[PDB]
Amino acid sequence: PEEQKINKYIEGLFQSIDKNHLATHVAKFTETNSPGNIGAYDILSSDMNCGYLDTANAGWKEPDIVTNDAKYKRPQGFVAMMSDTVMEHLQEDSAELRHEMEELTDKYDEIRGILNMPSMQPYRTNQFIKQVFFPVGGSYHLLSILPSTVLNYEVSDRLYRSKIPKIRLRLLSSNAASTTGSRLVSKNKWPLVFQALPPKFLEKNLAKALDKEYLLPDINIDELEGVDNGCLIDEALLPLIIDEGKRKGEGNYRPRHLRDERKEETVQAFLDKYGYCNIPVGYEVHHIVPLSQGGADSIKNMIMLSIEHHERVTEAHASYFK
Amino acid sequence: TLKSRPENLSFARCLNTTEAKFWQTDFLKRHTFKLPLLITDKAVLASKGHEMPPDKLEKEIMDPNPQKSQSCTLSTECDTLRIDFGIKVLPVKESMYSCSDYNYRTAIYQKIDEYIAEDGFLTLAKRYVNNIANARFLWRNRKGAEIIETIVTIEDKEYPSFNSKSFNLDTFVEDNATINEIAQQIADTFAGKREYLNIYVTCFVKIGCAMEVYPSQEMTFDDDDKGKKLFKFEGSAGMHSQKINNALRTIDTWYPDYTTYEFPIPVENYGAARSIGIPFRPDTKSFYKLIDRMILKNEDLPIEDKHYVMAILIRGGMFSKKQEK
Amino acid sequence: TLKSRPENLSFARCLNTTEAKFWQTDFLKRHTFKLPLLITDKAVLASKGHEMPPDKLEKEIMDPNPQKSQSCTLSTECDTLRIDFGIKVLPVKESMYSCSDYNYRTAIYQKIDEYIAEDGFLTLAKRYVNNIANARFLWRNRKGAEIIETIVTIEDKEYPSFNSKSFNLDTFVEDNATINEIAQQIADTFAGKREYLNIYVTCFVKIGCAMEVYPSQEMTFDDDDKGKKLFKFEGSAGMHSQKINNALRTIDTWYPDYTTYEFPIPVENYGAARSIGIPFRPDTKSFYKLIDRMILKNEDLPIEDKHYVMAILIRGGMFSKKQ
Amino acid sequence: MMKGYILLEKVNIENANAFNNIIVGIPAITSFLGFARALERKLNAKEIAIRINGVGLEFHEYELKGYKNKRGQYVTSCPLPGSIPGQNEKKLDAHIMNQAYIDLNMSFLLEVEGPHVDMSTCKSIKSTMETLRIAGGIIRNYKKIRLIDTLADIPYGYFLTLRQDNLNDAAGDDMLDKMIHALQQEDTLVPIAVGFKALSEVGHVEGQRDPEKDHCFVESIFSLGGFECSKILEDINSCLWRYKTEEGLYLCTII
DNA sequence: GTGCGGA
DNA sequence: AGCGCACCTAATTTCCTGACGGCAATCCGCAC
């Protein structure tokens, strides 16, 4: 009906001012599947010369009200609604309230419940609160972490009018925020937080991604006739070697901090594949693609050339690669 | 002597997969040559073609619908796609990170050791190497492919290659020599005889010249810009680790009613697959009931149920008693 | 008994089309010679010639109007445009990305199998190859052409060429041998007798020397400048994949009021043509009402209506119900 | 020997946690020292006696999971939730909580003191760094594990140091105003988490991870920090983090 | 299996 | 080797488009 609905509201408000507690730290803000009402209310002092920020060295102005279920949430709506907050009225009654209060319920004495509300207390732990070990003096202590709601509200308001880096997290829904049971999370469900990243020249891109990869030639030395065991006998195949190196190495110049080192295990491996235990006379190992124009240190980028043939390649490139 | 599951029990993963990166190559020069693949932006003009109530349909049937998107395609000179990822295999009895009660630790260690005695993790490992050989980690990239080859490297030994189009995606093979040789090493790592194994997988998919590649799509919530956002790993396209792992755990063929639906499903607690919207293992053959019949009321279960329970322990998760206040 | 469509249903595309790249050639030496085509930047001074309220017109009628734009033109030594693109064809029954009820999947598979039994996807495929033969994928580039030639290549076989200025755009031919031999392979890929088919298409358009070429234009969404921006594919001019594919789905001639307007329309859910400003399938012959009259309440529909439903399942989309 | 220094060079971590209730970015320092203490505990069960009493954190490259908008801001991403234990566990769609993930390349400097500090110790570390994680993230590859002697063998990078003087000495009524003003004056500083404070008293509750130890409910504490290159660093002791425990306070400090 | 309660 | 200038300065005006539209689905624990 109408003028008959107001009965249900003030019926429900007085039936649920016993399940609404006072808190600064709530447990369901980490995971909303944690059973019960676990949390803490920190009412201690401020040092202000200590080197660290906590919930007791910042100026937080509004406490928080917490319930277990979204059903028992009408006191939080009640304390937040006048013509000229309801909280400030019930601290110092101005009748402005008392006049309007007593003419619909005849029970404002009971409701004025919202004043000496009990504090939230930590009594147990579950699998949904983060528990870690910390070394204390030869043994360990088990620590269960409860996040701060009052500090999250305070940071998000003070970052809204500032120009330091910030990130907005958009991950909670309306129905998920209600299930937490806290007033300050149902109003701020998408908070603003600090951005704490390393300097901006140390971020990954594709230029840093391709400077850690190395090129290989496209010629199996074991199928190009003119090469025996691993050494070039012909003299005509030389132009093909000089060209391959040029093609694959044209502009990929690299500085020293970016070139694969010349290991000793690799020049041994090559030796084995074809027999020799030591490098035969007049022959010198050579990379088909140079190791300063970007190349690999592998068995698939190595050829043994005669001592004069190595002199031709080591200078013809030098002109083309300046 | 044991009345319930402990108050904090947690298992970690034993098959840890890293992210994947895409490259473009050519098939006749695929052992020597690779180029980067990049994600481009694309905007479209569309029509309003979704189901609407009859009042709105008479007012918005012929309105324009601009939207934002992103895409990835191969070049006009390359015809293949190269994907590289890696797996790390760790033992099962050392993947328990928390257990409040000591007697439950003793009982579960005994049960894993009896499962090492009979079928020492060899069936499941063969199924995992089958899902590496079938190339099921190519979700929409396996459709329309001329040649698919997969190469598996363990340590410094490169094994002979696979022809992934010669395998069916519903039947598990137990006769290939290469699959058995890899599966023995993965089984011995699972059993505790070895302490770690590192696997490196390379796949080559021949699609066509300028055809479309399908990367992994991100979950981002921004109110201003709603569009398709694709995964960039170090500037290049790739796939998430979760998709590759979900491809690898599709080994379950022991659910209650398999003779009608004859396909393998992923290994979950209540048999929940994101394709069919009815759970396949709803009550009697769930994980919790079988694990509270294997440890708490000592019983010998059939070997298929033991296979399912050990598969859940290789997948990992938070497995504890219902939480009271 | 199946009441309602499943909560998650989505079909994937069975006719994928790549992007297009533009080249410039000469007609007599076209099998041996090709050069790139690039987009330039052109800025213009204009006059204020838009319609204005009477007060503002007395203050802004003789003011300059600088604007930015872009443009593409051929060279002074070339006379022809070459466009290259490719098509991949995939089977229809293996193109359902999501379905959350196993009975609806069985029903869809049975209806597609009956359709394969009657007509093996041959009429629709003949229409798709006629749009390749008509050169309807050259929107403003077909006006003012001397010779248009289109070549189709599957695997390593080049089929005999097409004269695209001899095909009418409102009439579908069913007696050409080349169209039939390509259409049989597309039909066999659509039925399931072959797993994939890759088709590559090259077209030559003679338009003259130094004339204008019209590429595709990019969409701008406010937060960006409102100047004209044209599509660059690998440094050269090109067309979008979505624009080519619309020209190939203009195969619908089965709408309710066709006997008055006798032109083919593109295939959409509510039959919305943008050229003529009328929706042609708003109620009883839409996709949503026809798919709920074939599967949920078994009822044999005419063969014209089936042709439309199977054409929607080659395009794709999200067809999901809420409850 | 007895004292010594070991370098873990160029370690790649994928998917580490990057959310500490007011900060999205670099993980908290307690995880980076937790990696070292876990390495000590696994090395002391293989009977290689060693004790790590200091960690240095050098940063070479980073990437945050998400993208950057046109306006220059960061939008983060999350994986799709699966099945979470609780009441609504047999449902197909789960709920989305608050999370963030980062990728890092880093190098660690460890101060070890034991009965023998040789290359066999480095091999023992190499056979143990393939089973652990760093900050909830997997290790993909590393370059080398080697012993260093001086400040010329350390590779090029940027270390993270504590700057608490620039916080305690700034203008404001409370500490959060001090942090905001100190970040507006110097634009090379970052906010970091440095440990925990106490909200209760030590005792035994019901529902613990290990039921035979001592418990205390805690809250995280935050501070300031900044970056300094390797070649501009004075000593090898002005970049080493350590554990310190007062009564009610669990900290990590460079001092 | 139901409806609830708020931003 | 060992160097690689001193002086001054970089114009003014009139403007910078009109239209339409920017998806459907899903992400809630808990008393009773």
Indicate the SS3 state at residue B27: helix
Nearest to B196 by CA among B322, B86, B323: B86
* φ, ψ for residue C61, nearest 5 deg: -85, -25
Q: Which residue has the tokens 């023992």?
A: D124
CA distance A169 to A185: 13
Measure Cα distances from C11 to A15, A228, C87 in Å. 53, 59, 18
Measure Cα distances from A64 to A21, A130, A153, B44 in Å. 8, 22, 10, 47
Tokens of B19: 């992210």
Contact C63, C186 (CB under 8 A): no
CA distance C251 to C264: 6
CA distance B220 to B226: 9
CA distance D23 to chain B (A): 19
Tokens of A259: 């070139």
Nearest to C24 by CA among C159, C228, C211: C211
- How many Cβ atoms from other residues are within 10 Å of residue C260's Cβ? 5
Indicate the SS3 state at residue B36: strand
H-helix or E-strand spanning residue C191: helix C177-191
Measure Cα distances from A105 to A14, A114, B212 in Å. 10, 16, 69
Indicate the SS3 state at residue B135: coil
The yes-or-no reply on C/A contact (3 CB pairs or more, < 8 Å) is no
Contacts of C56 (CB under 8 A, 6+ apart): none
Q: What is the CA radius of gyration of chain D?
A: 20
The identity of residue A54, as a single letter, is D
The identity of residue C34, as a single letter, is K
Contact B61, C282 (CB under 8 A): yes
CA distance A38 to D182: 35
Positive/negative CA dihedral, B189, B190, B196, B201:
positive
CA distance C200 to B209: 10
Residue B135 Ramachandran class (φ > 0 left, ψ -120 to 50 alpha, else beta):
left
Residue C228 CB-half CA count within 13 A: 17
Measure Cα distances from A217 to A243, B30, B34, B79, B253 in Å. 11, 12, 12, 20, 47
Residues from A contacting B (CB-CB < 8 Å) are 33-37, 124, 126-128, 170-171, 204-206, 208-210, 216-218
Chain E positions with any atom < 7 A from a protein CB: 3-7
Instruction: Calculate the CA dihedral of residues D201, D204, D208, D209 and round it to 10 degrees.
Output: 90
Q: Which residue has the tokens 């010998």?
A: B300
* φ, ψ for residue C138, nearest 5 deg: -115, 85
The yes-or-no reply on A/D contact (3 CB pairs or more, < 8 Å) is yes
H-helix or E-strand spanning residue B232: strand B232-233
CA distance B42 to C239: 12
Strand partners, B233: B236
Contact C10, C317 (CB under 8 A): yes
Contact C244, C187 (CB under 8 A): no
For B177-221, the DSSP string reads HHHHHHHHHHHHHHHTSSS-EEEEEEEEEE--SS-B---PBP---
The identity of residue C54, as a single letter, is P
Nearest to C182 by CA among C120, C248, C249, C126: C126
CA distance B95 to D133: 12
Residue B106 burial class via C-beta count within 10 angstroms: exposed 0-12, middle 13-18, buried 19 and up: exposed
- How many Cβ atoms from other residues are within 10 Å of residue C65's Cβ? 12
Contact D158, D227 (CB under 8 A): yes
Q: In chain A, whose CA is at the least distance from the CA of B235? A: A206
Indicate the SS3 state at residue B116: helix
Tokens of B305: 């149920």
Q: List the single protein residue with the shortest CA to C1' distance from F20.
A: B64
Answer for D88: CB within 7 Å of strand F.
Answer: yes
CA distance D35 to D30: 9
Residues 131-150 of A with CB under 8 A from D: 131-137, 140-148
CA distance B252 to B265: 5
Which stretches of C54-160 are DSSP H helices? 54-60, 102-118, 122-134
Contact D54, D111 (CB under 8 A): yes
Tokens of D169: 């000495």
CA distance D101 to D135: 10
Q: Which residue has the tokens 């007791």?
A: A56
H-helix or E-strand spanning residue C178: helix C177-191
The yes-or-no reply on D/B contact (3 CB pairs or more, < 8 Å) is yes
For B291-320, the DSSP string reads HHHHSSS-----HHHHHHHHHHHHH-EE--
CA distance C30 to A121: 85
Tokens of A54: 């906590």
Residues 83-122 of A with CB under 8 A from D: 122
Contact A52, D222 (CB under 8 A): yes
Answer for C171: CB within 7 Å of strand F.
Answer: no
Contact B184, B122 (CB under 8 A): yes
* φ, ψ for residue A281, nearest 5 deg: -75, 140
Measure Cα distances from D103 to A279, C59, D15, D61 in Å. 45, 59, 6, 9
Strand partners, B157: B154
Interface test with A, best of D29, D102, D218, D255 (most A CBs within 10 A): D218
Burial B180-213 (b: 16+ CB within 10 A, else e): bebbbbbbbbbbbeeeebebebbbbbbbbbbbbb
CA distance A35 to B32: 58
Quick check: B209 and C18 CB within 8 A?
yes
Residue C118 Ramachandran class (φ > 0 left, ψ -120 to 50 alpha, else beta):
alpha
Contact B234, D63 (CB under 8 A): yes
Contact A317, A245 (CB under 8 A): yes
* φ, ψ for residue D137, nearest 5 deg: -125, 150
Chain F positions with any atom < 7 A from a protein CB: 14-18, 20-31
For D105-134, the DSSP string reads EEEEEEEEESS--SHHHHHHHHTTTTT--B
The identity of residue C129, as a single letter, is V
The spacing between the Cα labelled CA in B71 and the C1' in F23, in angstroms, equals 19
Residues 156-195 of A with CB under 7 A from strand E: 174-175, 177-179, 186-187
Quick check: D222 and A53 CB within 8 A?
yes
After which residues do gaps appear in chain A, with C to N over 2.5 Å? 81, 84, 112
CA distance A229 to B30: 25
Per-residue three-class SS string for chain A: CCCCCHHHHHHHHHCCCCCCEEECEECCCCCCCCCCCCEECCCCCCCCCCCCECCCCCCCCCCEEECCCCCCCHHHHHCCCCCCCHHHHCCCCCCHHHHHHHHHHCCHHHHCCCCCCCECCCCCCCCCCEEEEEEECCEEEEEEECCECHHHHHHHHHCCCCCCCEEECCCCCHHHHHHHCEHHHHHCCCCEEEEECCCCCCECCHHHHHHHCCCCCCCCCCCCCCEECCEECCCCCHHHHHHHHHHCCCCCCCCHHHCCCCCCHHHHHHHHHHCCCCCCCCEEEECCCCCCCCCCCCHHHCEEEECCHHHHHHHHHHHHCC
The spacing between the Cα labelled CA in D22 and the C1' in F32, in angstroms, equals 39
Tokens of D193: 């988490």
Angle between helices C122-134 and C303-315 (to 10 degrees): 60
Chain-centroid distance of CA B120 in Å reads 22
H-helix or E-strand spanning residue B65: strand B64-71
Quick check: D79 and B100 CB within 8 A?
no
CA distance B136 to B143: 11
H-helix or E-strand spanning residue B153: strand B148-154
Chain-centroid distance of CA A196 in Å reads 10
Residue A282 Ramachandran class (φ > 0 left, ψ -120 to 50 alpha, else beta):
left
Tokens of B22: 């895409």
CA distance A261 to A249: 17
CA distance D141 to A218: 28
Interface test with A, best of D83, D95, D214 (most A CBs within 10 A): D95
CA distance A217 to A301: 6
Q: Which residue has the tokens 């409910």?
A: D217
Q: Which residue has the tokens 């300050």?
A: A184
Tokens of C244: 């080519």
Angle between helices C102-118 and C303-315 (to 10 degrees): 120
* φ, ψ for residue B264, nearest 5 deg: -80, 140
The identity of residue B306, as a single letter, is K
- How many Cβ atoms from other residues are within 10 Å of residue D232's Cβ? 8
Tokens of B103: 């007697």
Per-residue three-class SS string for C238-270: CCCHHHHHHHHCCCECCCCCCCCCCCCECCCCC
H-helix or E-strand spanning residue C186: helix C177-191
Biggest distance spanned by C-alpha atoms of chain A: 113
Biggest distance spanned by C-alpha atoms of chain C: 73
For chain D, the DSSP string reads --EEEEEEEEEEEEEEE-B-SSEEESPPHHHHHHHHHHHHHHHTTTT----EEEEEEEEEEEEESEEE-TTS-EEE--PPP---SSSS-SSSS-------EEEEEEEEEEEEESS--SHHHHHHHHTTTTT--BTTBEE----EEEE--STTSSPS-EEEEE--HHHHTS--SSHHHHHHHHHHH-TTEEEEEEEEEESS-SB--SS-SSTTSEEEEEEEEEEEEEEEEGGG---SSTT-BEEEE-SSEEEEE--
CA distance D8 to D147: 9
DSSP tag of C114:
H
Strand B236-237 with B232-233, pairing: antiparallel
CA distance B8 to chain A (A): 6
Strand partners, D5: D111
Method: cryo-EM
First to last CA, chain A: 94
Q: Which residue has the tokens 């020599």?
A: B177
Nearest to C307 by CA among C250, C247, C252, C248: C252
Residues 61-80 of A with CB under 7 A from strand F: 68-71
CA distance A246 to A251: 9
CA distance B213 to B152: 23
CA distance D132 to D130: 6
Contact C130, C17 (CB under 8 A): no
A216 contacts in chain B (CB < 8 Å)? 32
Nearest to B75 by CA among B203, B236, B233, B213: B213
* C219: nearest nucleotide, CA–C1' criterion: F22
Answer for A13: CB within 7 Å of strand E.
Answer: no
Residue C173 burial class via C-beta count within 10 angstroms: exposed 0-12, middle 13-18, buried 19 and up: middle
Q: Which residue has the tokens 């939008």?
A: D75
B7 contacts in chain A (CB < 8 Å)? 127
Neighbours of chain B (3+ CB pairs under 8 A): A, C, D
Which stretches of chain B are DSSP H helices? 54-57, 102-117, 122-133, 177-191, 241-248, 287-294, 303-315
Residues 39-78 of C with CB under 7 A from strand F: 46, 48-50, 60, 63-67, 69
CA distance A170 to chain B (A): 6
Across chain C, the runs of DSSP E, i.e. the strands, are: 9-11, 15-17, 21-25, 35-36, 40-47, 64-71, 80-89, 96-99, 148-154, 157-158, 162-163, 197-206, 232-233, 236-237, 317-318
